[model samples]
Target chain A: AAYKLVLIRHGESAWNLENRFSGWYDADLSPAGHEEAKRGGQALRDAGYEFDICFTSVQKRAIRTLWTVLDAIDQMWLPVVRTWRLNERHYGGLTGLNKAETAAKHGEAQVKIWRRSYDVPPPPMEPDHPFYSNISKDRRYADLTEDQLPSCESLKDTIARALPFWNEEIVPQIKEGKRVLIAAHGNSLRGIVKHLEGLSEEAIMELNLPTGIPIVYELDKNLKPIKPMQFLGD
Target chain B: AYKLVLIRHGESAWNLENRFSGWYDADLSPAGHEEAKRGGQALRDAGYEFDICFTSVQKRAIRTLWTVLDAIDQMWLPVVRTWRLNERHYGGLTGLNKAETAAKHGEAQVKIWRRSYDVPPPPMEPDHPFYSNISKDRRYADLTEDQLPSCESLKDTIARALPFWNEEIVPQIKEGKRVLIAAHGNSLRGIVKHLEGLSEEAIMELNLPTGIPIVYELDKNLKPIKPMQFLGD
Candidate 1:
């Protein structure tokens, strides 16, 4: 039997439905978000994914979602390790701006390029911009490489930092025969899937991981996932 | 100014006060027990004394008292502990058996002795047999010579409780150390009277709700510059 890893995207927040970019911003799950997490937990329990330990982003939505899931699994006493490295991709100047307004201002093709291109950051947000300098300081990120603590990160830039932590911290735990779970956001999960399954940039762009779903992976003895990954959601 | 430390006992089962427990070892009230824990947290938040702690041996009082003292920031402090420090023993009227005593002794008379503060209840007869067992309980074994509790008047309770205070507690305070007393309401009152010089009549009126800590700031001569102040709910 292979080591198992279950990656879950947190349930929707008000901002998520509004289509606003939520880089480093913390927003709580609405009641519907809670229900989504509960459904995911039910699915996991039905599939018999009883985790021994769990990981989550430091953000409340991610933590709350994990809490709801664990509550469903009846494993609330399990230890949790939360980290800012699992945060959503930083959107830079466009964070909190209306999505359609930005597309109209920059034109459709340019907006698509910004959204889909892996290495291109949107723009360095203005230092005096209210959302720019006020991102909450994560003490854990104080020692991260300059590339890791970018003002904003493109999805590719996100993967550059996120993958290393996955290999160094997360993968080893799973390999050690510990049942592990990750509760996080959309793009962060995308970055992990990109590394885990070795997707090319274009392939990654087309792959949209749905909200409130557990993406299951089974790894071989050497820690290489053996079977095709399974994504669970409606 | 010396540091002031306050500790309330932990949650006891009887704190619910299902029955009246005077000198009877009724457990902590559910809420009473919770208050005991919060007392420790309040001390942790205020950053109070840490060197040592003292506790009575009664499980209800001592258990509540121990958790509060242990929950402080310096959890490892060695307890300079003892038991004569327990609350005043209710002579013939121990436990919630107060109603039975009242029925026999007349309600008005029971009320005067139990709540009046000065009139001690009638002593327990040696043949009452409850007296023989308490005399042999392990916690009180060392104080066997001093542990003669056939019945205790409030004055006798003071005399029994004060020796532990003067011999053990006062020396620490006199040596310029902070002393924390984790004990029951009446036992605590005995210590408070000796330190503040309250008249026996006045001491009777002092009633401490469970888990509330009274802090006193004292001078070199151990005189209070101000009145006692409570720490938390």
Candidate 2:
């Protein structure tokens, strides 16, 4: 029997719609995001996928996306686990900046490099940055030690944090035969994808993990994908 | 320093149309949804926040909890859904309109079945139309056949509910994790009766209003610091 796992990037958030740097900032799902998430869930339902457990980021967009999907799939009762490690890449001082504003301040080339570079993180965020106030004061991260909370993440940093949880919580569950569904952000998800698909830095940086699509994986006993991941409702 | 918050789910579809919804999966009416949001507003207005939330697997309670969390802006909070918190199982009486039920069975007999401390309503007949929601619902698939409730008295409701309170909830309370619960009327009442040490007969008069928050401040022994009180109203 093939072990099945599903990954969903959360629907477009208010920030995603406004074209701001979202990074660890909690943004509500846009109306478009809501529709997309519901459709994604329905697609999975039509495909006859049932999950024993669902995992999501603590961020609102990801959580809300999973909630909408679960409702569409008629599995509101399924247990969900939320982890901060699944949050989007920490965008640092670049957060809250629209592309135009960042282009004026940091130049388009620098902004592109910050976004495109795997290990070249943007400048560190201020200790008292607005993003910290949202996540740090949250009871969810009250247990996070100083270093566990990232000020800014290169895609490398995002992948490092998320991989441990994928190994510790998610991988074992799949091995145990629990059909798993994950609702998370683009970069955090790319981290999981990089490890599972053995993508190098250049290859992962080119991947987007399109919003509100359920990416399905079928694996063998060794957890190697039997084929490339396929998007539901494609 | 001791705090536990309990709330009953808002008025559901059956509540609006007047049915004995026991064990049948009923959703909240839109009006009830507003009330659920309002109660959450009251909690947020009063500076109430929770580290964790618990609700019955039943969608009515689960949906109500979500509305509350949305208003409270704590949708990111962790949640647990369990069957032990389900509303009183109505058995054969499930799905009948309250008034029709009264006409079929004498009002006096209906009163005994509904309000009686220990006497359960009749067990679900094989002909019961909503049996699919109970015996066939995938949510309860984990229960052993013998463990499923056929008909539940208030005492039976209390019997199944308290261990979760003592084991899962109490430890969290003592550990300083703020806890919020969204549940059914009888389930909330049973926990309250146990917490306040009310007699079985005395508990009959204690009813939690729908879509309301009841905050209980406790001492070291988990006794109420003050009398049970509503938060906003």
Candidate 3:
């Protein structure tokens, strides 16, 4: 039997409902977002999947959501490690801008390419750009390398940053018989699914994971999926 | 005018009141200890004072007290340290053996030894007794040869403690910066008497209730111009 890993992205944030690009900016979850996080926890408890350790991004949106889930599962005392490597994909110049406005200004094709493409990055947000610049100086992200960072990233660029941690840190824990849970961002989870199931870039674009769903992966000795991957929640 | 600071100790097992304590080294009351922490915060909030710091050797009392002090203006941080300032030293057995003491000697005698300032306590052996076991514990290794006491009389305690005030504490006050001392009842009274020039018998009668802080201001000559003020709701 292989080890089971459960991964989830945090619930909707105030920006998520506002039709804006949240990217690396710190914004709180809405009340509905909070309820979604609680539901994520209830789903995990309902499935009876207990996690021994959890990893999360340093942002409070993800952190608060993870806290809600863990509280529901009664695993608040579980050792939690936070890393900036797991943060949401940085949105470059578009960070904190309304998605509807950006689409209106730049055209829908350009906006979709920026949103869904795998490799092309938008022009890097200025270091002084409020959303992008504010976090560059934060202590938690201080140790990250330039390449591990993003002022803007396509879904592909997000994968480039998130994969190394998955391969170097998270996968080994699963291989060692430890059950793991990761609470992160929407695009970051998209990157993980792309690599785990070996989806083509085109197929990944069509995937829309709802907020706060736990996607389970059962992997073999080699960390390759031995059983079919599944998602919990309707 | 300078900054004034007060600190209460951190959460302690004894603060839970699981047992009776006197000069016995019981830990801070868990929540009572948090009040020690709030004392430090209250000091910071008022922008009151913060150049120097003081504390007792008891872990529960000083650690939480200092943490609050640190939380308030991080810049006010300095070389604040500990002495055996407010230790609640146990007499006789030194452990939580008060029930047994009351069983053997009657509760009134136990109460008298616990409270009376003139009575000398039955000394515990330095080797392995509960209350005064600093020898076995590495934390007390820094105590001077004479300062490492096995038992204490209220008078003996005053005699032992006052020198540290004149030597270490009073000099800082003379230097003209505000100083804060987080300590226990008897030792603090000893310092208070030294500052106020109270007589030995008069000093012996003063008692400090837990979690209340007493503050005093001094003149350039180290003479206290103001009476000790208590800060509490």
Candidate 4:
């Protein structure tokens, strides 16, 4: 029997509700987001899914989402591993900008390219930028070397950093035949999906994962998907 | 300098209502939330920083630690949660009001149950009206059936909690990383008794207030350099 892997995009964040570019700012979940997380957990329970261990980004939104899901499943004691590699793509200069306002200011075409482009990152935030102080001075990221901390990242860059975690931490667990659940940001999950499904750059562009939904994958001995991934509660 | 900071969680709903809440999983009251925030602020004001943290699996301890980490601006710090740090199991008296328990049982008997070092309260039946079975809790699913406690004395709590201190927490303190603990009154008292080398009689007189951060500075031998100080006193 193939091992099961569950991926859940975290619920709505404060920035998600504000329509701002959140990046890795560590914004918390909105109240509705909390409900989404509980609903996701209930869906997993309804499907009779139980995880041996869970993984999440270090950000509170993803961590709290996992907490609520685990709480719903009555498995709040499951061991959890948190990693910065699973964090969202850094938005740099556009970190806290309203998406609509940025589009108005930068022109829709340019903003679209910045938002959806596979390679071109938004302009890097200057060290003296007011918002840069949060990331630069944040103790949580103190372990990150200068190079590991990003002012901005393209989706490709996100994939590059995130794949190592999949290979090192996540793959070993799957190989052990442990059921695995990951609660992370949309972009981070997209990066993993791109790897697992072997989606092309163009194919990946169309992927838009709704918040607080669990995507289940059954993988064969080699860890490739045995069938098309299915969304639980769909 | 090697530093160990111990924090008892703020008031829980039961604490505010004067109930015996051992292992009942009541959340913090609003005042408890304020106390937690202030405890965090007190730790920050004391210029204390920690590399790692530990807490009980209970929500009160976890939420208090969360508030502290947020106040200290170190929300990303790694935290280890264990059942060993849980409050002593009250068994048959698990959810009863203290005054009611005293009224039902003579005050002397209740006093012995409350303060006796080795004497535990009456064992709670697995199917007790006020209690939920631990076997049904998924968080403790990994524990063996024998490991679950129906009742615990302060002595039993020490035995349960001391092993974790020796195995998981001591090594981190020895490694020069500042260690912070957010736990219940009894659990912290157990740890303090172990650290201060107090006797059963000495431990009985040790009363820890809620929402206070007790800072213990240790020497090269891991012995206390001076009396433990309460931050923001």
Give the TM-score of each candidate: 0.53, 0.95, 0.55, 0.85
Cα lDDT tens digits, model 4, B160-219, are: 999999999999998988999999888888898988899999887887877878889898
Tell me how far the alpha carbon of residue A181 in candidate 2 is from the true structure, in angstroms, after superposition: 1.4
The TM-score each candidate achieves on chain A is 0.91, 0.96, 0.92, 0.97
Per-residue lDDT for A91-201 in model 2, tens only? Answer: 888888788888999988998888789999988788666566765566777889988988788999999999999999998899888989999999999998888889889
Worst 10 residues of 4 chain B by lDDT: B129-138
Can you write out model 3's per-residue Cα lDDT over B68-168, one digit (the tens) per residue? 54445332233334444655444554544557668756877778886677677666554434643444343455567776666666666676677777788
Best by lDDT: 2
Off by over 4 Å in 2: A128-132, B14-17, B102-111
Best to worst by lDDT, what's the order? 2, 4, 1, 3
Question: Candidate 3 at A138: error in angstroms?
Answer: 2.5
DockQ measured for candidate 3? 0.04
Give per-residue lDDT, candidate 4, residue B76: 60
Candidate closer to the true structure by lDDT (higher is better), 1 or 4: 4
> For model 2, how does the per-residue alpha-carbon lDDT over B106-169 read when each residue is reduced to its tens digit?
8998988877799988887778788766878878878988888888899998989999888898
Please give the lDDT score at residue A73 for candidate 3: 75
DockQ of each: 0.03, 0.72, 0.04, 0.34
Name the runs in model 1 displaced over 4 angstroms: A136-147, B1-233
Task: Please list all clashing residue pairs in model 3, or write none if there are none.
Answer: B3-B48, B3-B49, B4-B48, B4-B49, B8-B36, B12-B30, B15-B29, B23-B88, B23-B89, B86-B184
Query: Across residues A1-234, which tens digit of lDDT does each residue of candidate 1 receive?
Result: 578889998898878878777787766677888899999999888877677667777576787788678767655435466667788888877778778978877788888898778878887666775675456354335446666566888888777767777888887788777889999988888888877778899999888877788889888777667877898755
Off by over 4 Å in 4: A31-35, A38-50, A71-74, A100-110, A175-179, A218-222, A226-234, B13-20, B44-48, B71-73, B96-112, B130-132, B144-150, B231-233
Quality of model 3 by C-alpha lDDT: 0.67
Candidate 1 residue A206 C-alpha distance from true site, Å: 0.9
Decoy 4 TM-score against native: 0.85
